[PDB]
Symmetry: C2
């Protein structure tokens, strides 16, 4: 019940999909990490990666570069370590010295940077999707969040990495894509909709899901 | 390796020896160890992984209790909680957090989440009045995982009082060894010996020490 199953299922689809519809993108999916690579990374960052994340890394060590997630790049373990230390530097500088918010409220710490936010995806422009290993009081450990330069408001986009990868997989399978050989971008197929930034899609989905759930209290 | 396990083992030696010499009645309240099963069961209940030094401490004493008044707590009146009490109280605070009180703050700033209650604040000590010392498994951006904090009903401002449970237990041990106490075998209370200090609430001592340490660190 950690999301490992989803991680594996998701990668099957994503692997098969890219090979069929975008071999060029498939070609960028790296070989697995070894357990040593992971132990080394865990020791460097003084952190324990969630099971589904470890699972994902043992399938592909990121990408080697048009990014897989509708333009956003799956980070290599080395990139994860480098960027995590980058964010850790930011958090220290901030210690000494734009309202930070969270959807759902109190799910994610209301801060610009946290040492326990491990980035796994990048827009190569300062923004990330990653795992939250230090949730707010109404958050969940190893929930998947957006954070970064332009993420003054953070979003919980999935309960775990597995469910994130799967919802991406389901978008591919549902035909919610346009090619621009080309660059992969999101469009909602059922609505006959325009091209949209995938972060905007994830944000709207989080926002909607939050709202449909508010009624329930118990 | 650098988690405070050493310090936990060392501390409990000085604390076991001290109580036996200066307050056998208090020594008598220190429970037998937990088994690994007790701990695994607790970890499974709370869906949480206890830090190493905490596990170590539990495998020396499962808190304190006595049938015979109420329990005179080890930490200058504050009671070391049994694993059962830890599980029960953690679930109690988890209920509070779900149901959710002035501005919540942290010393050092941003070391502790600025909230009244968090599911990952595991209480280990109680004043039996709503307040705790415990482990923070979800620190703020300038905090440290498994740092030791004050929280509870009267702790709108939270304090990081140690880097880990080991260092906490040891600094308590050092207070005992420095003669910073007074018996009222009666009830154990804090006083600073080296200066001829008054009787003080131990929470007030820890708060002042944290505040001072924060300044010119």
């Amino acid at each position: 019940n950690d999301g490992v199953s989803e991680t594996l299922l998701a990668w099957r689809h994503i692997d098969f999909w890219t090979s069929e519809h975008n071999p060029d993108l498939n070609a960028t999916l790296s070989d697995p990490c070894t357990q040593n690579d992971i132990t080394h990374a865990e020791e460097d960052l003084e952190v324990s990666f969630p099971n589904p994340v470890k699972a994902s890394f043992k399938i592909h060590d990121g990408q080697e570069t048009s990014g897989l997630f509708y333009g956003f790049q799956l980070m290599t373990l080395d990139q994860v370590v480098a960027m995590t230390q980058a964010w850790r530097n930011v958090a220290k500088n901030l210690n000494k010295r734009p309202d930070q918010k969270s959807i759902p409220p109190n799910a994610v710490q209301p801060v610009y940077a946290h040492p326990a936010w491990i980035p796994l995806i990048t827009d190569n422009a300062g923004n990330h999707i990653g795992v939250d290993l230090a949730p707010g009081p109404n958050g969940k450990y190893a929930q998947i969040i957006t954070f970064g330069r332009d993420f003054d408001t953070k979003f919980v986009i999935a309960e775990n990495w597995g469910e994130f990868l799967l919802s991406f997989a389901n978008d591919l399978e549902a035909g919610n894509w346009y090619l621009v050989d080309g660059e992969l971008v999101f469009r909602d197929k059922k609505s006959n909709g325009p091209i949209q930034d995938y972060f905007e899609v994830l944000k709207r989905r989080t926002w909607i899901k939050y709202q449909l759930e508010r009624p329930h209290r118990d």
